[PDB]
Amino acid sequence: KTHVQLSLPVLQVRDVLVRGFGDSVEEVLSEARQHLKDGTCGLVEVEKGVLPQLEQPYVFIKRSDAAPHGHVMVELVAELEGIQYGRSGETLGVLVPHVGEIPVAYRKVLLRK
């Protein structure tokens, strides 16, 4: 399927143990997609002071459309030293590995895969 319904655990930035997916734009987009498929991906909601506590390159989920079955359609955009790889809508959050942190909420998304 071109899209997959996912429910992403929303994590507090200070709980996150693994603060990014890797060391290059291509690697972090690769790893984010693998963790999304494997159900091992968390979401951190972006506010003042969040991104400097996480590791670049960043992987964002961004709204791709204006929401089947409650799932917002999203796509992945990476960012490294202020340059973004991809073009999409509003940020829903920054993706990180999930290694068992307790979430505060779930974000239902339809991921363009």
DSSP state for residue 23 in the 8-state scheme: S
Rounded CA-CA distance 43/50 in Å is 12
Q: How far is CA 109 from CA 6, 42, 53, 112, in A?
A: 5, 12, 24, 9
Does the N-terminal peptide bond of residue 9 adopt cis geometry, omega within 30 degrees of 0? no
Contacts for 97 with CB less than 8 Å, ≥ 6 apart? 17, 18, 21, 31, 35, 40, 41, 42
Q: How far is CA 93 from CA 13, 106, 109, in A?
A: 11, 12, 11
Rounded CA-CA distance 71/104 in Å is 18
Report angle CA 29, 33, 39 to the nearest 5 degrees.
140
Method by which this entry was solved: X-ray
Q: Which residue carries 């429910």 as its tokens?
A: 7
Give the H/E segment covering residue 29.
helix 25-38
Domain boundaries, the chain: 3-112
Contacts for 79 with CB less than 8 Å, ≥ 6 apart? 56, 57, 58, 60, 85
Short-list 42, 58, 24, 33, CA closest to 101: 42
CATH level 3 topology of 3-112? SH3 type barrels. (2.30.30)
- Structure-block tokens of residue 55: 């590791």
Rounded CA-CA distance 66/53 in Å is 30
